[PDB]
Amino acid sequence: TDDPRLLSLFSAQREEDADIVIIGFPYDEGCVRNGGRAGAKKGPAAFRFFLQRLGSVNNLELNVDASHLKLYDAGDITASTLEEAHEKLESKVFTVLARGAFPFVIGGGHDQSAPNGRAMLRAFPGDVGVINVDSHLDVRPPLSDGRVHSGTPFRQLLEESSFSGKRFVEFACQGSQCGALHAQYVRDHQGHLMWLSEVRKKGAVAALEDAFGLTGKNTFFSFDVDSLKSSDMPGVSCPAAVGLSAQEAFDMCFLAGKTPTVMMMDMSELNPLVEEYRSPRVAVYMFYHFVLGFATRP
């Protein structure tokens, strides 16, 4: 009515006409394999519910009007197996990238970041950066019989010959939850560990600016919502005791939105089975702040 919100930006009767394309990845098998609580497969549905409801397109507090932006919802990736789902996701994200549009993928388990990253490495050969905003490092080895999971995505991206580890940042990781062997693996690959305490000392936005300085061009902004403290964000498989505040997350997403080198974003681990109302709202508000930032891109 007299209060236009995100829903209103879905004007693009055709996908190729949209600045931003939302893709859903409703799988949590990766999570279960990594010993996590099931439920993240309901993330895309919960995200969509509040997507229809939240976020003033013209925000007079930040003074950003996102009216001119065109969003499109490409629906969910559908497949018979997780492994087939990954392939279709990678293929889909690539095509959006290839024609210069911005894919935003709502999961679902963090395993989605492997295919998403692969789509990046193909769209921008030898020139990709990646930041993982996560309380965890997610460079865990695969299952004994080779199966991937919510904890392996950045092991398989660091194993990519075309990817420079100097351009990988683990952001807001927590020492109480990250093993020395996994930190060692990241650092040995020249990756950067920006611990939660360091982010908090610098300020989250300032720290993220530093991170983006390291990631450089063609950055994949990968956000695991279990990097947020569970007081603000309880609805995840691995709820954090300490972590980023909702405001820090909003501010970070806004920065990512305005940063022209950020070429795609995913958001993983939203788990409506754990908490179904407050948390999906935070997730949608995070995307909302990204949208506002993106609205300021030249």
List residues near Mn ion by CB under 5 A.
110, 134, 136, 138, 224, 226
- Is 156 a binding residue for a copy of itself by CB under 8 A? The answer is no
Compute the Cα dihedral for 135, 269, 102, 87 and give only its sign: positive
Write the interaction track for a copy of itself spanning residues 197-236; mark x where CB under 8 A is met and - where it is not: x-------------------------------xxxx-x--
Contacts of 288 (CB under 8 A, 6+ apart): 6, 54, 55
Q: Is 45 or 62 the residue whose CB approaches a copy of itself more closely? A: 62
Site string for a copy of itself, 235-254 (x = CB under 8 A): ----x-xx--xxx--x----
Residue owning tokens 């018979």: 80
User: Which residue, 113 or 174, is less far from a copy of itself as judged by CB?
Assistant: 174
List, as one string, the DSSP characters of 266-294: EEE-B-TTT-SSHHHHHHHHHHHHHHHHH
* Interaction between residue 145 and a copy of itself (CB under 8 A): no
Task: Please state, in angstroms and rounded to a whole number, the distance separating the CA atoms of residues 22 and 103.
Answer: 6
Peptide bond into 108 cis (omega under 30): yes
Task: Name the DSSP class of 262.
Answer: E
Binding part of the chain for a copy of itself, among 40-48, 55-63, 110-118, 208-216 by CB under 8 A, reads: 55-63
Residues found near a copy of itself in the complex (CB under 8 A): 2-4, 54-56, 58-62, 65, 141, 173-183, 193, 195-197, 229-232, 234, 239, 241-242, 245-247, 250, 277-278, 281-282, 285, 288-289
